[PDB]
Amino acid sequence: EPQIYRWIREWGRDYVSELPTEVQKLKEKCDGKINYTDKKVCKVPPCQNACKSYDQWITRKKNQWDVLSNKFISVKNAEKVQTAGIVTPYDILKQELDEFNEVAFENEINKRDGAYIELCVCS
């Protein structure tokens, strides 16, 4: 169905425009010089609060993506017709976005990306 394809395209355009704004909120409070000492998230309250707000945002993105992926699978299972080159929901994002990368997206929504690890995990 073209409908779920449209929803995934709209969701992915919205996600790629919000993600750098969300990461920049963490950088403002959590970034520091690479000095071999504790990351700011270990004890700086405005950094810890920024991480909590990013975690709320990315958790919501993961839940939305899970809903849309299941709708994609339900649609592919109920319809016979195919869309060329489209096997997964990632192929819709790859086809419509500029330099969408599946591993980067999967890492971001699972808090395994460099920004969340380097800014929000204490070490």
């Epitope: 690479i34 990368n101 591993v103 890492n107 395994r112 990306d113 460099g114 920004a115």
Partner: antibody, heavy 118, light 108 residues
């Protein structure tokens, strides 16, 4: 399309330092999601991850090399680099630069053979 | 560190055969395992990540399975361009380490 391009000498004398650079083209080294890494494959042997770096400058190194390896990043030149000191012929290998998705290396350079010889 | 051990070291199969490569971890790595293919004169390419997720753009004949310590890469229908060395790699914790590689040769 993002491409990784290695550069640096193919011949290094024993005891000197091997230096290689990876230039990102069609994309940016200033990725808030990815790390950037180096992997090597000595002739007729297995792959060995050397280390990875985040665009902030944070690094992770294989303990097999941590006492003689330095990985750097230059976001103003869209590049990252490797320096391996005190090389021996055991360091002769194909060296690859790679985009490191926190363990899943999803894009690799073509590789550069570096021979350690006098 | 974690040691990854692949088997067999080499295998020969005909076009259309089902090929299986195993990878065993010295300790549990959950599903943090990747499979790479290295075709002649080329740098490796990622085929599978998270033990069973097929990367977009990679042929559907590649599949990954397993969890904990035992993993398998299966090529459901071997093709001539599958002549390559296949490598497993864990990413459970640093350092990332690879198996020794498996060479797949074609019979004709």
């Amino acid at each position: 399309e993002v491409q990784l391009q290695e550069s640096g000498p193919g011949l290094v004398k024993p005891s000197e330092t091997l230096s290689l650079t990876c230039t990102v083209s069609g994309g940016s080294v200033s990725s808030s999601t990815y790390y950037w890494g180096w992997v090597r494959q000595p002739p007729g042997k297995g792959l060995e991850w050397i280390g990875s770096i985040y665009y902030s400058g944070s690094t992770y190194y294989n303990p097999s090399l941590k006492s003689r390896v330095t990985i750097s990043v230059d976001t103003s030149k869209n590049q990252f680099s490797l320096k391996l000191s005190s090389v021996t012929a055991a360091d002769t290998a194909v060296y690859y630069c790679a985009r490191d998705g926190t363990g899943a290396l999803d894009l690799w350079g073509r590789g550069t053979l570096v021979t350690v010889s006098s | 560190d974690i040691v990854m051990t692949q088997s067999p070291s080499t295998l020969s199969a005909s076009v259309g055969d089902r090929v299986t490569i195993t990878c065993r971890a010295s300790q549990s790595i959950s599903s943090w395992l990747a499979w790479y293919q290295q075709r002649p004169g080329k740098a490796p390419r990622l085929l599978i990540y998270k033990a069973s997720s097929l990367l977009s753009g990679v042929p559907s004949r590649f599949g990954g399975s397993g969890s904990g310590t035992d993993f398998t890469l299966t090529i459901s229908s071997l093709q001539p361009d599958d002549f390559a060395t296949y490598h497993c790699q864990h990413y459970n914790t640093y350092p990332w380490t690879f198996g020794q590689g498996t060479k797949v040769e074609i019979k004709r």
